[PDB]
Amino acid sequence: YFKIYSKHTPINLVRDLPQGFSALEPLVDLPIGINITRFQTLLALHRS
Amino acid sequence: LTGTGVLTESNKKFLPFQQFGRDIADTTDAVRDPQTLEILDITPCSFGGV
Ligand SMILES: *[C@@H]1O[C@H](CO)[C@@H](O)[C@H](O)[C@H]1NC(C)=O
Numbered sequence A: 001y002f003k004i005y006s007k008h009t010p011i012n013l014v015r016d017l018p019q020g021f022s023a024l025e026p027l028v029d030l031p032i033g034i035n036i037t038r039f040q041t042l043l044a045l046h047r048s
Numbered sequence B: 001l002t003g004t005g006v007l008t009e010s011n012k013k014f015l016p017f018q019q020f021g022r023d024i025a026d027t028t029d030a031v032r033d034p035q036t037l038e039i040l041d042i043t044p045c046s047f048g049g050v
């Protein structure tokens, strides 16, 4: 079971993480049944 | 999930993910019914000492 828990928070801090409490609600309970040992996030380029 | 009780209306604001509820004994105290998605509270039937 691949569990994705998510939370969106309106913040106004410039650089670091805000200090506070916010519980993450479960978003997607995903039935994959596969082995995961390594990950990589995806960014987006800007072209001009 | 099997059990005995009276099913009543409830005022517990369940979150979308949340389906059932559990008491201290871990016995189910509220349940979300399939097909109609409503939240039914489960209150044990009246009992006591004769
Ligand atoms: C997952 O993969 C790693 C290496 O790829 C392996 O050592 C590990 O035993 C695997 N786990 C399962 C549950 O297949």
Ligand SMILES: *[C@@H]1O[C@H](CO)[C@@H](O)[C@H](O)[C@H]1NC(C)=O
Pocket: B034, B035, B036
């Ligand atoms: C059947 O159950 C689904 C939830 O699993 C619900 O969305 C749907 O409205 C139900 N349909 C009927 C006809 O009860």
